[PDB]
Design a protein around this ligand. Structure first.
Ligand code: A1H8B
Ligand code: A1H8B
Ligand code: MTA
Ligand code: MTA
Lengths: 303, 307, 318, 318
């Protein structure tokens, strides 16, 4: 279908857009060639079959992390040290490379798009955090705030200048580029995943390496729960008015939590690491997970 | 003139990567044996029973290529001294696996990081590997001249950088090394890969590394200034350091992306060559002595013996 | 040897504790109304010349409960003692088994398993490995005696003991092998710098999935004097059942008992320690399919070499 | 290591013999009328980087018969090679297994088992023990390739080689350990006194109840010259299937093959031998649950010391 013959085993990311087309990233973390790819599925249930895809493209290197830049654009965190931007064509069959800027000196692990939509922030193993302009295609700022590999960065949903970051230096930094010293350290186990609350601009949750999912207010006193037995890879809130939190981990499970971090759902569907989760915008009770076992499971969350 | 290598943490095709590196004038290539992000489980099901090949085939290169042109790298996720018991046990099994595969390939060297104070369990595992089968592979300990915490940007509002002169504290990375190599009991297989930072420390911090087994000197692309022509150069501070390092006859490794995008990547190496040629030439002493560096010999006894 | 078992048997305090431990467990497991209905299946794992078997008989009599004894023993020389006793005294209540407990295919599951596989550093006789292998023929609600044991360590200064170890250099091995192996010794002319702290712990029956007996423990010992560290004294405590215990830890030492002297883990080079400083020691328990061994290293106030890497100087045979 | 497997693979004569051996067995086991009905289950035990797997594919193609391959390999580093090959080339016909053959629980029984577990003295890689353990998942009418192998010994005079062994004395072990261990060596500057004679033989599958791989063989070598005995050259023959064989015995040496140099069993002290006298050597194959080793002693014309008692100087790891 005007795309690569075969996609890679390890599925790294899965995102839904407005209408309900499932974006897929994937890397080969084994075998002769260690490269990545991007895929589109107007039919979510057809995944991850390569013969029934709307769009698909092979990238130079692996895909560590991606996210939607609205409807057309796809921003990639590459192992090469490049942050790549791809854009769907007007037919939405091809995927042409917009930019591909080698600025990080090591693997780009995490990326997130800021409120404006013309800016993004990336985090790499070279310990830096960089602020991009997607229009001019240049780095606005470069920040060595952490003292170890940057794990996860997460843009504030309604504030352009604000974003979170976390690193193996055991720091969770809350940023605000308006301040001269932008970073602000929020006061045991290393933070691995971040997620802003969708309806509250001052609330966020973080998952750690030990498996604990926490609930933090920016003002004050925190709440937490031991959800997973191993590292929390990602956290994604549902599109509900009263949101449910979906937590994934390396213990090969999925858990859907309420507002007080009480377990509602449990899914031991995957056989390998669970890498991403994305709620269906059409049906808010559906949740799609992807993993290194090369499954694309669709969960019916009891809501 | 100068022996140089290339550090990469991203190799999509091992055959293609070498060709590019070799064309630029590098002698060897530092690269991973397992994909940096390919995290593996060894205890808990079902991830421990993950199918398929764990990495690339040894057949992709020739035996000679592995033996002379490739330096191994421990994966970044491997943390043997983690506070979490699970991660510790997993990193142990992973470290042994990667080290074993290194020996299987017959790699001349393998890089392990010293990026924190406590590397005790790291040392305990490496020592165990050293006392296993048959291999003569060197282990280069990646250790920074200045710790990452001490060269971070002062941009955290409620955590400012230490603006105090701490004489002992600025020598901390040497203590990292010293403790490690003491635990390993001065193994001749364990040497230093000294990573040079943007801001060099005080002179005493550098003098600390005199008389240490420095085999490599890692040079990030970020530390290079740009001249009027628009090509990479170094400061007078770094120039004196490289001049000192050229006397020790170390192997210079280049790491990081091309910040001088307009030029080639050979330019970095060409500058080291430029420095190599531009040094004070060996005198009658150093010309004749060249060969007998740190070579132990018995004191002659012309009375007892007949010369 | 025979006389090695003899001196074990000459410690009545130890066995009276075993007797009491079994006595209590029998009462807990069997109520008064099921006195003559329920016969408990006991299995002495490592019977030797049969002190624990005798104690199991005494315990059942003072409790007034019915028991069915197995006497598993691998040592065939001891099994000669057991069978001669069994024929003359015990009878068909005791079934002498001449086998390894890890191998033995049990014809019945046990309600209680009794064992005496503890050395001076608790787990130095591989009690974990043996009881793990014998775990399958325990009932789902079965008990082990002992149910738990812990090892303790304490830094010591002894220029005597250091010099004693030094003198254990032998031909045709590493010059410093003697420093990389523990010794059983009645510590006399020595100074204990800090109070003992717990090193390794083992529970039986082990219910942690994929049972791993490998360990790594960091201890920090606050020293309040100037001194010179020469090694680490090792002790142990064990919980036989509940409040019945044995111990050679000085502060909680079982009175009268003399069936265990302390163990000593030397170091190659003495280490100066100033008043106020902390001695930091690291202890590993390591294994493969053939051997189990310890490694250790001092990390404060100065670093030592890691001792006994890969069990080069000392292993315990599986 | 990789390059150790590389040099093995660079002996085409050896594998062509394996190819031919399997080719013949396939034709014998599967008739012409059952060509596309019967799929034979082959199991390469010790696959390495997969030369025997490739040969098994070639053999099946030249025979024109259907096969289902397993590729058992314990070395995890080699298993990387196998799986990359398997994904790219072989496919789902070959099932790569990453396990010990003694441990592996087979999901199917084999019609043929292929192995390459032979050293220079045949059984010095413990091919008996491995194939004995893998014997249970062979069909009752199953075949092993090789089906048999024998080791040969011959007394040699070499003042060079004696002096070479002598020089292998190392610190921190027995002064004469070097004499109590075999060496792989291309014997050049030496004199063979008597003609080689068979020492130890092994058949697979072994059908002798309570299979014992321990042995004791007495050989008498008629010497027809004055000389000085310095050791014993060791060779081997193997029957892959029927008339297809491999050999490094000088008189029946496979032409071209260079995947095995002879082995040498030294002696501590040289032994005078007059013309007409007989050299009498004794060879043991010994074992316990952990190790296998050889011992040996000359008993004529004079006695030597028994070499390598209890495998003190040399063991082979199980
Ligand atoms: N399963 C068992 C059951 C009883 C057990 N006792 C032990 C302790 N142990 C040794 O390891 C050891 C090693 C030796 F070369 C010599 C002696 C011992 C002892 C056993 C006796 N004894 C005290 C003593 C010694 C000498 C005295 F004049 C008085 C009193 C120890 O210290 C392990 C163990 N293991
Ligand atoms: N499973 C297998 C499969 C093949 C196998 N070949 C062997 C023999 N072997 C050793 O034991 C050995 C031990 C060593 F330190 C070094 C080499 C060997 C050899 C393998 C190669 N080679 C011939 C040679 C050597 C050097 C040459 F320049 C040319 C030709 C031997 O003599 C066991 C075995 N076991
Ligand atoms: C009473 S001292 C401990 C006793 O346990 C025995 N023993 C140790 N290990 C085992 C084992 N695995 N199976 C059976 N008996 C054992 C020893 O032979 C000794 O007599
Ligand atoms: C082709 S050289 C012999 C091969 O057999 C393998 N091997 C030896 N013993 C065993 C065993 N018990 N189980 C599986 N593979 C084995 C070795 O790892 C080697 O690759």
């Amino acid at each position: 279908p005007n795309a690569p013959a075969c996609m890679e085993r390890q599925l790294e990311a899965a995102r839904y857009r407005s209408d309900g087309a499932l974006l897929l990233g994937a890397s080969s973390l084994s075998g002769r060639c260690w490269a990545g790819s991007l895929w589109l599925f107007k039919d979510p249930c057809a995944a991850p079959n390569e013969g029934f895809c709307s769009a698909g493209v092979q990238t130079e290197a692996g895909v560590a992390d991606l996210t939607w830049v609205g409807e057309r654009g796809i921003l990639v965190a590459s192992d090469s040290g490049a942050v790549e931007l791809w854009e769907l064509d007007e037919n939405e069959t091809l995927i042409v490379s917009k930019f591909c800027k080698y600025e990080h000196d090591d693997i780009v692990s995490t990326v997130s798009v800021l409120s404006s939509g013309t800016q993004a922030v990336s985090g790499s193993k070279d310990i830096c955090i960089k602020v991009w302009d997607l229009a001019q295609q240049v780095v606005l700022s470069s920040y060595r705030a952490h003292a170890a590999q940057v794990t996860c960065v997460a843009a504030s949903p309604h504030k352009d200048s604000v974003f979170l970051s976390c690193s193996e230096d055991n720091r969770i930094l809350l940023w605000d580029t308006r301040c001269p010293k932008p970073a602000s350290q929020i006061g045991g186990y290393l933070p691995t995943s971040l997620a802003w609350h969708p309806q509250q601009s001052e609330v966020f949750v973080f998952g750690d390496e030990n498996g604990t999912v926490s609930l933090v207010d920016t003002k004050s006193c925190v709440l937490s729960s031991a959800v997973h037995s191993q590292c929390v890879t990602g956290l994604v809130f549902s599109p509900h008015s009263v949101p449910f939190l979906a937590s994934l981990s390396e213990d090969c499970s999925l858990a859907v939590l309420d507002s007080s971090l009480s377990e509602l759902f449990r899914s031991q569907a995957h056989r390998d690491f669970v890498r991403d989760a994305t709620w269906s915008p059409l049906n808010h009770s559906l949740l799609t997970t992807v993993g290194w076992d090369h499954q694309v499971v669709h969960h019916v969350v009891p809501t | 003139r100068v022996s140089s290598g290339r550090d990469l943490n991203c190799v999509p095709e091992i055959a293609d990567t070498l060709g590019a590196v070799a064309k630029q004038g590098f002698d060897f290539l530092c690269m991973p044996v397992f994909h940096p992000r390919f995290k593996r489980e060894f205890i808990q099901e079902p991830a421990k029973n993950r199918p398929g090949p764990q990495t690339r085939s040894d057949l992709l290169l020739s035996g000679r290529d592995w033996n002379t042109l490739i330096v191994g790298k421990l994966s970044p996720w491997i943390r043997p001294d983690s506070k979490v018991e699970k991660i510790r046990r997993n990193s142990e099994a992973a470290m042994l696996q990667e080290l074993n595969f290194g020996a299987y390939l017959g790699l001349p060297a393998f890089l392990l990081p010293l990026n924190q104070e406590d590397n005790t369990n790291l040392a305990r595992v490496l020592t165990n590997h050293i006392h296993t089968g048959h291999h003569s592979s060197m282990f280069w300990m990646r250790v920074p001249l200045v710790a990452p915490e001490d060269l971070r940007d002062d941009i955290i509002e409620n955590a400012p950088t230490t603006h105090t002169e701490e004489y002992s504290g600025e020598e901390k990375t040497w203590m990292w090394w010293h403790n490690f190599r003491t635990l390993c009991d001065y193994s001749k297989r364990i040497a230093v890969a000294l990573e040079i930072g943007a801001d060099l420390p005080s002179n005493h911090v550098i003098d600390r590394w005199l008389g240490e087994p420095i085999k490599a000197a890692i040079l990030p692309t970020s530390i290079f200034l740009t001249n009027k022509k628009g090509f990479p150069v170094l400061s007078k501070m770094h120039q004196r350091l490289i001049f000192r390092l050229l006397k020790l006859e170390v192997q210079f490794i280049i790491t990081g992306t091309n910040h001088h995008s307009e030029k080639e990547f050979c330019s970095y190496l060409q500058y080291l060559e430029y420095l190599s040629q531009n040094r004070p030439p060996p005198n009658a002493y150093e010309l004749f002595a060249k060969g007998y560096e740190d070579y132990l010999q018995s004191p002659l006894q012309p009375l007892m013996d007949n010369l | 040897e025979s006389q090695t078992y003899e001196v074990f048997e000459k410690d009545p305090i130890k066995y009276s504790q075993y007797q009491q431990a079994i006595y209590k467990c029998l009462l807990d497991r069997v109520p008064e109304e099921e006195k003559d209905t329920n016969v408990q299946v006991l299995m002495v794992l490592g019977a030797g010349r049969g002190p624990l078997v005798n104690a199991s008989l005494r315990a059942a009599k003072q409790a007034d409960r019915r028991i069915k004894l197995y006497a598993v023993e691998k040592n065939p020389n001891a099994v000669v003692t057991l069978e001669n006793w069994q024929f003359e005294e015990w009878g068909s209540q005791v079934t002498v088994v001449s086998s390894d407990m890890r191998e033995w295919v049990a014809p019945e599951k046990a309600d209680i398993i009794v064992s005496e596989l503890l050395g001076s550093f608790a787990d130095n006789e591989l009690s974990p490995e043996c009881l793990d292998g014998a775990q399958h023929f325990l009932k789902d609600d079965g008990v082990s005696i002992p149910g738990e044991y812990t090892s303790f360590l304490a830094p010591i200064s002894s220029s005597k003991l250091y010099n004693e170890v030094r003198a254990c250099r032998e031909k045709d091995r590493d010059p410093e092998a003697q420093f990389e192996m523990p010794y059983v010794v009645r510590l006399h002319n020595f100074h204990q710098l800090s109070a003992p702290q717990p090193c390794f712990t083992f529970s039986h029956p082990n219910r942690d999935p994929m049972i791993d007996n490998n360990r790594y423990c960091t201890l920090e010992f606050p020293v309040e004097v100037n001194t010179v560290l020469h090694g680490f004294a090792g002790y142990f405590e064990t919980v036989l059942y509940q409040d019945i215990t044995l111990s050679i830890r000085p502060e909680t030492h079982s009175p009268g008992m003399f069936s265990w002297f302390p163990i000593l883990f030397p170091i190659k080079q003495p280490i100066t320690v100033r008043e106020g400083q902390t001695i930091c020691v690291r202890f590993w328990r390591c294994s493969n399919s053939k051997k189990v061994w310890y490694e250790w290293a001092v990390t404060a106030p100065v670093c030592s070499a890691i001792h006994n890497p890969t069990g080069r100087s000392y292993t315990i045979g599986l």
